[PDB]
Amino acid sequence: GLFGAIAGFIENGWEGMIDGWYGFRHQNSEGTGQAADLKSTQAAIDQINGKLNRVIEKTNEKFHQIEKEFSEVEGRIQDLEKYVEDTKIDLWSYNAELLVALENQHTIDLTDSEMNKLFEKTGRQLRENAEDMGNGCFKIYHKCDNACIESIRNGTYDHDVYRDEALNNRF
Amino acid sequence: GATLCLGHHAVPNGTLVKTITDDQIEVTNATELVQSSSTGKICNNPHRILDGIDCTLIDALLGDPHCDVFQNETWDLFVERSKAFSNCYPYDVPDYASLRSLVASSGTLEFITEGFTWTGVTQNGGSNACKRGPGSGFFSRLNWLTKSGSTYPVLNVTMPNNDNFDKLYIWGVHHPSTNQEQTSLYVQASGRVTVSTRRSQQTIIPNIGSRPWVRQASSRISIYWTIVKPGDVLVINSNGNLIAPRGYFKMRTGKSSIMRSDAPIDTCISECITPNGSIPNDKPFQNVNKITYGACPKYVKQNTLKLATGMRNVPE
């Protein structure tokens, strides 16, 4: 994708994460754990639902049309009837091929984008108390018990609390 | 200290989709946009479906006796079966396709009898080619005129349209196999049928000659039609061979059509109908049949197109 997170700097996905699309894994003093991020997950799903509903939006209802199969050879008029329908079908077949190609490239790029948004947001949250290892992981340079980890995940982590501690361990 | 890794989900069995850059790339999930299956059955709701059974629309229109059950019927979709057969006097319709289309589109066979006066001819002619009960008969909506005594005078009749709707008149011309038959039935050696309005006229000369034997006759009837608008007038003039109308069909405009299909009709609800049967219309495209009726996905040549409903799948 355009942002280079999914199938990029994040090496792979997590089959274990079944309660969300994006999220967190940690190691601290108290052990390891895993939690889905709901807001990133929902942003992606909402956008995909949006495009799905646009695509499956019934647009056409047709009644009496032209005949499309013929039991006798007729020539000119029938040639035209067949050609009209064949022309139409090819144009619609093209529209359909293009639509899915554009939609799917964009779906891959937007999901890659939401991963990246979550990553940059977390990075900003941690300020000078952490560093980007480059594989989607932050090394946090202070003691971060489960309460502290959940604080980063639910958006409450005050970086000023741990700054002195962390600046020291970094330098 | 501590480690906090950001990541995304994956699944063991992803699905392949197409993009701008890749004709196959794996995502966590996708959904199908091409409807490729049917039940094999035409749902009887919400459209009024009329099964022609043994009858073409044209035979029901004319009133072939085995199609009498279709008198004054209406439909959103008339369904013609491949087993249908004609069983009345042998006939052709120049521009059959147009007559079938206009009637199909009108959506009704509602017929109003009118009091035509055919002075000096015998009415209600019939044939063993077209049995009605045990005896000889004819198309219900047509009136086969022949000589009375030893004369067939010039028929000259008018029927004005003083209604506020269009009238469809179905009429015909008889083509004898022999000169003997011509003079026997119509006296004059050569007949003539002229049907006109203020706006149009059709004149047909019968042709005498053998055609192949069909249901007892080497003769034929040719079928024509004339629409009469409000305030206009029908005139029919003939010195022989007229197969007269008994009245007119009322015409409508609306959503009615016709379809060739052998799918059975069933009790269910489907907006979209194909000759293969009803299909769902949740998907935007379909590959079942280019012939459709109703709120239908658009026909495409692809039998599958996957819309990605998830991210790129990068497993463990």
Ligand SMILES: *[C@@H]1O[C@H](CO)[C@@H](O[C@@H]2O[C@H](CO)[C@@H](O[C@@H]3O[C@H](CO)[C@@H](O)[C@H](O[C@H]4O[C@H](CO)[C@@H](O)[C@H](O)[C@@H]4O)[C@@H]3O)[C@H](O)[C@H]2NC(C)=O)[C@H](O)[C@H]1NC(C)=O
């Ligand atoms: C076969 O049937 C048709 C349909 O009815 C029939 O048409 C009618 O012909 C008559 C004349 O033959 C038409 O009468 C005319 O009507 C207008 C007004 O609408 C009058 O102005 C006319 O008057 C003049 O012409 C007269 C006849 O020569 C004169 O005597 C008079 O002095 C005036 O100059 C005339 O009365 C009638 O309108 C039509 N009807 C329709 C519906 O068109 C036709 O005549 C029949 N054909 C045969 C060969 O019998």
Ligand SMILES: CC(=O)N[C@H]1[C@H]([C@H](O)[C@H](O)CO)O[C@@](O[C@@H]2[C@@H](O)[C@H](O)O[C@H](CO)[C@@H]2O)(C(=O)O)C[C@@H]1O
């Ligand atoms: C209205 C009328 O004259 N009806 C006749 C009918 C016609 O004269 C005939 O269909 C014109 O082509 O003829 C009927 O008799 C037929 C014979 O004329 C024909 O030569 O042989 C037929 C049997 O194969 C048949 O007997 C008819 O069609 O039944 C008699 C009818 O009253």
Ligand SMILES: *[C@@H]1O[C@H](CO)[C@@H](O[C@@H]2O[C@H](CO)[C@@H](O)[C@H](O)[C@H]2NC(C)=O)[C@H](O)[C@H]1NC(C)=O
């Ligand atoms: C729907 O009906 C059409 C019309 O018969 C089917 O088209 C035929 O399909 C077979 C392929 O299995 C061919 O041998 C025929 O020549 C096709 N005929 C035409 C006119 O295209 C079509 O396959 C049916 N589709 C479904 C899903 O039932």
Ligand SMILES: *[C@@H]1O[C@H](CO)[C@@H](O)[C@H](O)[C@H]1NC(C)=O
């Ligand atoms: C994906 O969407 C489908 C609907 O086609 C659903 O049934 C399935 O549980 C969802 N997730 C998958 C297959 O990963």
